[PDB]
Amino acid sequence: SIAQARKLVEQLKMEANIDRIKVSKAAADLMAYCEAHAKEDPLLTPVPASENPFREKKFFC
Amino acid sequence: SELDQLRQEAEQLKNQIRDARKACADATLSQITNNIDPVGRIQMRTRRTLRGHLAKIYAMHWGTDSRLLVSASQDGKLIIWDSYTTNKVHAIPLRSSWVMTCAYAPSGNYVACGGLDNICSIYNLKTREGNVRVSRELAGHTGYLSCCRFLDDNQIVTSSGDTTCALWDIETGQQTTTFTGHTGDVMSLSLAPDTRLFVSGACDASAKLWDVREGMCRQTFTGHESDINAICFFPNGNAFATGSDDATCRLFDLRADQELMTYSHDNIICGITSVSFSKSGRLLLAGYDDFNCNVWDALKADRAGVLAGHDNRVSCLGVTDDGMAVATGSWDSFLKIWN
Amino acid sequence: LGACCLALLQIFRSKKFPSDKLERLYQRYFFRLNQSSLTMLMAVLVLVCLVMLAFHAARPPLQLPYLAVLAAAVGVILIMAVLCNRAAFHQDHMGLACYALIAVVLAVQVVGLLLPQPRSASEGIWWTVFFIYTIYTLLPVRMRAAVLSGVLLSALHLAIALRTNAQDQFLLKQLVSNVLIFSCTNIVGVCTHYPAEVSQRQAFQETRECIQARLHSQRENQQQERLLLSVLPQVSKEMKRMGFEDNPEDEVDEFLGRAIDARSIDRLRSEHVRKFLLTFREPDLEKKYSKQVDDRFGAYVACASLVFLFICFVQITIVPHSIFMLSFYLTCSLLLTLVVFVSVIYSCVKLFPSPLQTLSRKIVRSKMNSTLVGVFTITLVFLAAFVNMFTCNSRDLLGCLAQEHNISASQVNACHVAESAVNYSLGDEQGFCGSPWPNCNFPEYFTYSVLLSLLACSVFLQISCIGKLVLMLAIELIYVLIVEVPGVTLFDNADLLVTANAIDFFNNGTSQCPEHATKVALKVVTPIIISVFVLALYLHAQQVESTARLDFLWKLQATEEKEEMEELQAYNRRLLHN
Ligand SMILES: *C/C=C(/C)CC/C=C(/C)CC/C=C(\C)CCC=C(C)C
C-alpha cells in the first residue's frame, strides 16, 4: 500500500490542478440549454394526439 | 511517519478543495430558481402496459428507432417489443436465472446482457441464416456485472464488482482498456453524447469521471452517506445526477465540480429505484420503493406528480430518445408506459 | 312435480360472486366488452323506430302526438348512443342506461300501441316482439329486470288491445293467440337469457379458477425460490437488488386488472383473428377451439319443443282442425319427440342401453350431428308453419264480387263490399263462391309463427352465424315467396274484409266511408319486418360469436402462459435438482 498512497497523492495532484467554473456561469448555461430545448420537449408542449403513437385513437360505428 | 504526513496533507488538499469550492459557491441553484415558476402538476397516465415477463424486470433499453425496445426479467427471458404496436419482436430464454443488465447496439445489429456470470453475452439478431443466436461471450471480469455500454460494434464498456470496469475489443474479446479506482461495487455508468467521457458510481461513497480515450479519473464527487445505487447524466453533458441510499438525489456539474440541487422529502421514507429526465430536463422522474414513483420539477425539485401503478420497487425506467413516452419496469412483472 | 318447481325457484336466485371487489372488476371487464353491444342495440332500435315510423307514416291521418313522441324517442336514443360512445361515460351508469332504454321502449311501445290505425289485435305485434326479443338478447339487463320488462310489455300490449278492441266478436281468438305469443316470447327470452347469463358466469368463474391456479402455482414457486436463494450462498446489496431483504386475492385482482388493461380486445381480435371469417388465423388455434364441447343443447331442444307445443296450440286454436293438419303435426311431434329423446339420452346416458348411449355421445360429441339435428328441427318447424297453409282457401273473392257486383276491381272500396256484406263475411268458414276451402283470416300469425320460428333460430346459439344466416334466409325467402306468390289473393281478400270489419258499420246514411286503406299492405309489410328481424338476429349472432371467441382466446392465452410458467418452473426445478 506504499506505492498506492503515492498514487493517491499524485492523483490529488491531478484533481487539484483543474480549472473550475463559477456556479453562476454554469447554471446560466444549463438554464439556457433547457430554454433552447424546452420548445422541443413534448412533455412540456403536448403534441396533437394524431402525431402521438400513444394517443392516436378514434372510432365510432 | 509519512502516512500521517500524507493523511494530513490529504486533509489540507481536501480543505484546499473545500476552499476553492466554497469560493465558487457564490450562490446556489435553489436560490436562483426560487424565482422560476413550478412546472405544475405532471400527471402522465399509463398508456401501454407491457406484460409477458413472468417476474421482476431488471433492465430495458430502447432501440435507436424509438419503436423497438429490449427488456430483461427474472423470468429468464429477454423480450424485444414493437412499442408502437407493443408486439413482441424476440423472446430470448436466458442461460442464467440472474441477469442484472441489458443493452442494445445503437445500430441494433447486436445486443448484450450479463450478471453474476462474469460474462457479457452478446446476441446476434440478424444472423445470415435467419436466426437469433449468441455471437460473443465477454469473459474476464471477476465480479458481478452491474452496467455496460458499447463504444462501437467492436468495442464495449462494462462494470463489475471486483473494483474494476473494462473496455473490450469485441472482435478481440479481451479488455482494451481498464477503468479501475473505485473501492466498492461499481453500479452504473453513462457515456457522453460525444462518447469521449463517462462517469461511474460505486459503494466507496465516491463517483468518478473517466476519459474514455485516456481511462484515468478526472473528477471525484461525494456527499452521499451510503452506496450510490444509480447515476444519470444531464442531457447537455456538462452535468449529471446521482442517487444513493441516503434518501437524496443530487446534481453535479462538470465545470462547477460540485452539487447544485438535492431531491428528497420528509414524508418520503422509502428509497428511490430509478431516474430519468424530460427532453429539456425540467422534469426529474424518480422511482420509489413504497410502490410509488414521484415526478419532480428538476429545476425546482418540487414533486410535480406521482406515477403509482406498481405494487413493488419500480426497478428501472427510461424515456424514449424522442421524449414521446416513458417506460418503467417493476418487480410486479409489469412494464408501464407513461405520457 | 314439486321438486321440479322447487328447482325452478332455485333457478331464479341471481347468481352473484361473493366479493364486491371481484364483482366490480368483472363488471369493468363485462362493460368494456359490451359497450359495443349496447351501442349496436341503440342503432338497431333506431332502425326499428324508423321502420315503425314509416309504417304509420305510410298511411294518414298523421296524429301529431305519435310523430312527436317517435321523434323524441329517436332523439333520446341517439343522444344516449352519443353519450355512451363518449369514452368519459362512467361504466356504473350503463345499467341505468339500459333501464332508460326500456322506458324509452315502453314509451315507444305505449305510443306504438295506442295510436296506430286501423285497429287490429295483429297491429304492432311485430315491433313489440322485436323490442321484447331485443331486450332479451341485445339489452344487457338483469334477469329480474328483463322478466319484469317483458311481462310489463306483454300485459300492457294485451291491456291496450283489450281496451281498444272490446267490440270484436273474434276478439277471443286473437287475444288468446296474443297471450300465447307473449307467453312464448317471455319464455323463449328466459330460455335464451338464462343460458347466456349462465355460460358467461361459468366461463368467468372457470377463468377465476385457472387464474387462481396459475397465481397459486406461481405463489408456491415464489416461497420456494425465496428460501432457495436465501440459503443458497447483511444480505449483500447484490442479493438485495436480486429482490430479497429477508390479501393475496387483492394482489391477484390488481395484477389481473393490469393484465385486463394491457390486453386490448379489439386489437387482439384484429391481430389473431381474420376480420371477416372470424376463424382463428392459426389453424391449430381453430383445431383447439373446435375441440371445445357444448353441454346445454338438450335444454335448448326442450325449450324448442315447448315452443313447438305452443305453436301447435296456437295453430289448433286459430286454424280449423284438419285430419291432414293433425296427422302432419302428429308426425312432426313424433319426430321431434324422437329427436328430443335422442338429445336427452346424452344427459341420461346411464339409463339407456349401450347402443343408444353410444349414439347419444356420438351426437353431442359431434357438433356436426347436433347442428344437423338443429337444422332438421328448424326445417320441420318452418314446414309445419305453412304446409297447413296449403289447406287454406284460394278461390278469388274479388273476381266473385266483381261478377256479383258487376263493378271494376279498381273501383272496389270497402263500402261497395259492405253493401254486399250479406253474402261474404269473415265469419264464414265455408268456402265463399262455392269454394270447398275455409278462410284463413289472420295469416300474420303465420308470420308471427315464422317470427317464432325465426325466434327459434335465435335459440340455437351455436349454429354458425353464417349457417344461421343461410338457414334464416332460406326461411325468409321461402316464406316471403309463399306470402307474396301464392298467398297474395288471400291477403288482398283479408285486407279488404279486415278493412270492412274495422268500419264500425252504423247508420251510414251516405256511402262516404272514412276511406283510405289506413294500413300498409301486409304483403309489403311482411318482407320488411322479416328482413329487419333477420338483420337484428344477424347482429345478435355476431355479438354472441365474437364473445364466445374472445372468451376462448383469453382462456387460451391464460392456459398458454400457465403452461409456459409450469415449463419454466419445471425447468428451474430440474436445474435446482441438477
Ligand atoms: C356509422 C353510423 C351509421 C348510423 C351508419 C348506418 C349504416 C347502415 C347501413 C344502417 C342503415 C340501414 C338501412 C338504411 C337499411 C337499408 C336496407 C337495405 C337497403 C336492404
Side-chain angles (χ1 to χ4, degrees):
Chain A
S1 62
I2 309 177
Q4 176 64 14
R6 304 177 186 277
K7 300 178 179 180
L8 173 61
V9 176
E10 280 146 339
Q11 162 50 13
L12 296 174
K13 198 175 191 176
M14 307 299 97
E15 305 187 5
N17 296 147
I18 64 176
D19 55 329
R20 295 177 175 79
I21 261 172
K22 297 181 175 60
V23 175
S24 57
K25 294 158 60 178
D29 313 357
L30 303 182
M31 182 176 62
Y33 183 90
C34 306
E35 179 183 0
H37 299 257
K39 308 102 176 290
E40 286 80 321
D41 194 327
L43 307 181
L44 310 178
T45 309
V47 305
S50 308
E51 309 171 355
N52 188 322
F54 312 91
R55 298 180 174 179
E56 291 141 24
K57 176 182 179 180
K58 252 168 185 181
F59 187 71
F60 284 171
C61 46
Chain B
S1 84
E2 187 59 38
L3 290 170
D4 293 325
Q5 297 177 327
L6 288 169
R7 287 173 184 176
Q8 86 120 319
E9 173 64 15
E11 183 59 46
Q12 274 154 312
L13 274 168
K14 298 180 181 182
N15 293 328
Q16 183 185 325
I17 294 175
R18 297 165 179 177
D19 301 351
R21 286 178 174 174
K22 291 192 184 307
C24 300
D26 54 356
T28 71
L29 178 57
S30 56
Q31 297 167 4
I32 302 175
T33 60
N34 196 16
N35 210 335
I36 68 176
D37 298 334
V39 78
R41 294 190 176 183
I42 296 297
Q43 48 198 10
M44 298 180 292
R45 319 187 55 185
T46 175
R47 316 300 182 171
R48 304 282 202 282
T49 301
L50 304 180
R51 208 267 162 199
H53 286 320
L54 316 176
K56 302 164 182 180
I57 301 174
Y58 295 136
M60 61 78 57
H61 192 248
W62 279 102
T64 49
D65 62 357
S66 296
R67 179 175 181 179
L68 312 180
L69 56 138
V70 189
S71 62
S73 173
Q74 161 176 27
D75 63 4
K77 296 187 298 182
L78 205 79
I79 300 179
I80 307 182
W81 308 81
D82 172 10
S83 61
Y84 300 172
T85 73
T86 304
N87 300 333
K88 297 146 174 176
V89 201
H90 301 97
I92 309 171
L94 305 184
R95 243 169 246 183
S96 178
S97 306
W98 305 275
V99 48
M100 285 184 65
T101 177
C102 61
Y104 218 156
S107 67
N109 307 328
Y110 303 94
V111 297
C113 63
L116 173 62
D117 61 353
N118 97 344
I119 299 179
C120 175
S121 305
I122 274 63
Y123 281 77
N124 193 333
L125 310 184
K126 290 158 181 172
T127 307
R128 171 58 69 92
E129 313 188 355
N131 291 277
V132 178
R133 307 262 83 175
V134 181
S135 49
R136 187 66 57 176
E137 285 177 330
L138 306 179
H141 272 308
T142 59
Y144 70 87
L145 215 74
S146 61
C147 180
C148 59
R149 292 295 176 265
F150 291 89
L151 312 189
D152 52 67
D153 286 2
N154 195 14
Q155 289 169 103
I156 182 172
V157 185
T158 66
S159 58
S160 169
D162 56 6
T163 70
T164 69
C165 299
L167 171 59
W168 305 80
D169 173 8
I170 302 176
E171 191 67 13
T172 306
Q174 303 179 2
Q175 296 182 353
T176 282
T177 301
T178 316
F179 302 91
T180 65
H182 288 290
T183 87
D185 296 3
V186 190
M187 315 314 307
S188 174
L189 56 83
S190 178
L191 307 173
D194 60 5
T195 62
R196 294 185 179 181
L197 311 174
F198 87 90
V199 295
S200 55
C203 306
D204 54 9
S206 66
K208 300 179 183 304
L209 179 61
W210 316 86
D211 182 325
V212 177
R213 294 186 60 180
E214 310 283 15
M216 59 165 247
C217 172
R218 301 195 139 179
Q219 299 174 44
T220 296
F221 310 87
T222 66
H224 297 299
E225 326 184 32
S226 191
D227 309 333
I228 302 175
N229 301 334
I231 183 166
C232 169
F233 252 115
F234 195 77
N236 87 332
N238 296 125
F240 69 93
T242 57
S244 179
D245 287 319
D246 64 359
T248 70
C249 298
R250 335 192 169 196
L251 175 60
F252 301 82
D253 180 308
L254 312 182
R255 297 174 296 177
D257 188 69
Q258 62 174 99
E259 180 189 335
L260 304 183
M261 189 63 81
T262 292
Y263 313 87
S264 60
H265 191 250
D266 293 4
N267 286 325
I268 301 174
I269 305 173
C270 63
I272 285 84
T273 80
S274 45
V275 288
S276 58
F277 280 109
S278 52
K279 185 167 181 60
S280 63
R282 176 57 175 277
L283 296 182
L284 175 60
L285 280 46
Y288 284 85
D289 170 61
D290 75 336
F291 315 159
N292 299 331
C293 168
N294 296 322
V295 183
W296 296 85
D297 184 337
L299 298 188
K300 300 203 76 169
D302 303 321
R303 174 161 69 264
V306 188
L307 310 178
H310 300 291
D311 298 312
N312 205 330
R313 190 177 288 173
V314 190
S315 58
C316 46
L317 46 71
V319 186
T320 59
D321 289 358
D322 59 2
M324 276 295 184
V326 181
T328 62
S330 173
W331 292 359
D332 62 2
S333 77
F334 290 105
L335 269 150
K336 268 164 171 278
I337 314 304
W338 305 76
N339 191 315
Chain C
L1 243 82
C4 193
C5 291
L6 276 164
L8 285 166
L9 285 167
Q10 284 175 320
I11 295 170
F12 291 107
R13 282 189 169 191
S14 179
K15 296 190 176 190
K16 189 199 171 191
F17 297 102
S19 167
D20 269 333
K21 184 178 171 181
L22 187 62
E23 179 74 15
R24 276 179 261 171
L25 223 114
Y26 169 73
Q27 287 194 276
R28 195 178 182 210
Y29 166 63
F30 174 84
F31 285 125
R32 221 182 220 230
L33 188 73
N34 291 319
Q35 188 175 4
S36 184
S37 188
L38 184 62
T39 61
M40 295 301 286
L41 167 57
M42 295 299 183
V44 184
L45 286 171
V46 169
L47 179 65
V48 171
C49 295
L50 290 173
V51 169
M52 291 184 298
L53 196 91
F55 292 156
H56 194 75
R59 295 292 182 175
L62 290 90
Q63 296 172 348
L64 207 75
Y66 188 91
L67 208 79
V69 170
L70 284 174
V74 170
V76 172
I77 293 164
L78 288 172
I79 291 165
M80 291 302 295
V82 173
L83 290 173
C84 295
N85 270 310
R86 284 187 171 193
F89 196 75
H90 204 259
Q91 291 183 271
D92 301 341
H93 303 313
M94 271 63 159
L96 186 64
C98 297
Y99 293 120
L101 192 63
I102 293 163
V104 174
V105 168
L106 270 159
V108 172
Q109 194 200 26
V110 170
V111 179
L113 295 171
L114 285 172
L115 299 188
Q117 288 193 348
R119 64 180 184 74
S120 171
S122 54
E123 275 300 339
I125 290 170
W126 73 268
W127 63 62
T128 299
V129 170
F130 186 93
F131 293 149
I132 293 164
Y133 172 80
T134 290
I135 288 167
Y136 281 105
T137 54
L138 299 180
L139 189 71
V141 283
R142 286 185 169 121
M143 181 56 162
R144 287 183 176 168
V147 174
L148 288 170
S149 305
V151 174
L152 179 61
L153 289 172
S154 308
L156 187 56
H157 186 120
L158 281 157
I160 294 166
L162 180 67
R163 282 287 188 177
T164 51
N165 303 295
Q167 292 175 327
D168 303 341
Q169 290 186 352
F170 49 81
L171 179 63
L172 187 65
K173 287 184 177 174
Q174 292 186 312
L175 196 79
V176 170
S177 303
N178 295 2
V179 172
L180 290 171
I181 290 164
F182 300 145
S183 292
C184 188
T185 302
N186 277 276
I187 281 164
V188 175
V190 160
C191 286
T192 51
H193 181 95
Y194 174 77
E197 183 175 356
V198 169
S199 21
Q200 287 173 353
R201 287 182 178 276
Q202 183 179 345
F204 178 79
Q205 183 170 338
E206 289 182 9
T207 302
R208 181 175 181 261
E209 183 178 2
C210 168
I211 288 173
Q212 182 174 355
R214 175 180 165 161
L215 286 172
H216 182 354
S217 189
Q218 282 188 145
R219 185 172 297 157
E220 290 180 324
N221 178 49
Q222 290 143 205
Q223 293 177 335
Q224 298 162 215
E225 179 164 11
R226 293 182 183 174
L227 304 184
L228 131 58
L229 188 147
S230 126
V231 183
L232 188 24
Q234 198 187 14
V235 172
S236 83
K237 276 181 175 194
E238 184 179 2
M239 296 297 103
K240 279 185 176 179
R241 221 181 194 178
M242 295 236 185
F244 329 105
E245 298 215 335
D246 56 354
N247 179 5
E249 299 198 288
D250 283 313
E251 186 186 4
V252 168
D253 282 8
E254 192 186 5
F255 187 108
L256 180 59
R258 294 177 189 186
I260 291 159
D261 274 327
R263 301 178 191 197
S264 50
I265 285 164
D266 299 307
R267 179 175 175 175
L268 264 133
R269 179 189 279 142
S270 77
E271 285 171 340
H272 302 82
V273 184
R274 297 191 187 191
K275 283 187 174 184
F276 298 96
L277 282 146
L278 285 182
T279 66
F280 292 104
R281 289 185 184 170
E282 302 181 350
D284 297 311
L285 290 178
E286 198 71 35
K287 190 178 180 183
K288 290 179 179 180
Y289 183 61
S290 72
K291 290 184 173 193
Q292 195 172 8
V293 184
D294 199 328
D295 306 338
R296 303 182 307 193
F297 178 71
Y300 315 144
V301 182
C303 188
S305 307
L306 174 147
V307 174
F308 162 85
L309 293 174
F310 273 99
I311 289 167
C312 291
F313 295 133
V314 169
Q315 289 290 333
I316 291 165
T317 304
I318 294 295
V319 192
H321 308 159
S322 173
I323 300 175
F324 176 74
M325 170 268 266
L326 187 63
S327 302
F328 187 78
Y329 291 169
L330 185 64
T331 305
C332 292
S333 190
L334 289 168
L335 290 172
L336 290 169
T337 302
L338 181 66
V339 182
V340 173
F341 181 74
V342 172
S343 306
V344 171
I345 289 171
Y346 186 79
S347 307
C348 294
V349 190
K350 293 183 179 178
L351 283 93
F352 293 99
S354 315
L356 279 101
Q357 302 180 11
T358 300
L359 181 62
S360 189
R361 277 184 279 198
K362 190 177 182 181
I363 293 164
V364 179
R365 292 181 168 170
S366 174
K367 190 169 186 169
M368 184 177 70
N369 297 348
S370 57
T371 300
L372 281 163
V373 173
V375 172
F376 177 76
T377 304
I378 296 160
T379 301
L380 289 179
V381 182
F382 171 54
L383 289 167
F386 75 86
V387 156
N388 196 32
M389 196 170 74
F390 298 119
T391 63
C392 288
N393 186 8
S394 63
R395 277 202 172 195
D396 172 25
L397 182 60
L398 197 147
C400 176
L401 283 168
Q403 190 176 0
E404 188 175 348
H405 265 286
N406 203 19
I407 60 179
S408 63
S410 56
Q411 291 176 339
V412 177
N413 62 29
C415 282
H416 306 154
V417 186
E419 288 175 350
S420 293
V422 181
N423 293 350
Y424 309 120
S425 75
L426 286 124
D428 191 3
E429 295 182 350
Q430 300 190 22
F432 55 68
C433 309
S435 195
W437 301 95
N439 310 327
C440 297
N441 301 338
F442 309 101
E444 68 273 31
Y445 289 86
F446 297 119
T447 300
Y448 307 147
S449 300
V450 172
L451 294 182
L452 293 181
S453 82
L454 290 171
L455 293 186
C457 187
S458 75
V459 190
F460 293 88
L461 299 180
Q462 276 204 21
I463 300 178
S464 62
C465 72
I466 290 173
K468 289 181 176 178
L469 181 62
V470 173
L471 182 61
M472 290 184 305
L473 288 172
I475 286 167
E476 174 173 15
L477 179 64
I478 291 166
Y479 185 66
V480 172
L481 284 169
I482 298 166
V483 172
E484 291 291 346
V485 179
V488 66
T489 52
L490 187 68
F491 281 65
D492 287 333
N493 291 338
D495 279 329
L496 183 63
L497 285 167
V498 171
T499 304
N501 185 88
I503 306 171
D504 292 344
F505 198 106
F506 283 130
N507 301 255
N508 310 348
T510 303
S511 59
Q512 287 177 335
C513 349
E515 294 175 351
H516 227 314
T518 321
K519 186 170 169 174
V520 187
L522 188 66
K523 65 187 175 197
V524 183
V525 172
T526 283
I528 296 170
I529 291 170
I530 293 172
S531 308
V532 169
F533 263 83
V534 172
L535 178 61
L537 290 170
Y538 170 65
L539 292 176
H540 174 240
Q542 193 185 11
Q543 177 64 4
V544 170
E545 179 166 8
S546 179
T547 302
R549 286 176 174 272
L550 192 78
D551 294 342
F552 177 81
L553 183 67
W554 285 353
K555 189 164 188 159
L556 186 67
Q557 183 184 355
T559 46
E560 290 172 348
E561 289 179 348
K562 179 187 166 190
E563 286 173 3
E564 289 183 352
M565 196 69 57
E566 286 185 351
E567 288 193 351
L568 184 62
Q569 285 190 163
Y571 175 89
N572 285 344
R573 190 174 186 185
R574 288 172 185 180
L575 189 55
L576 188 70
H577 288 316
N578 198 29

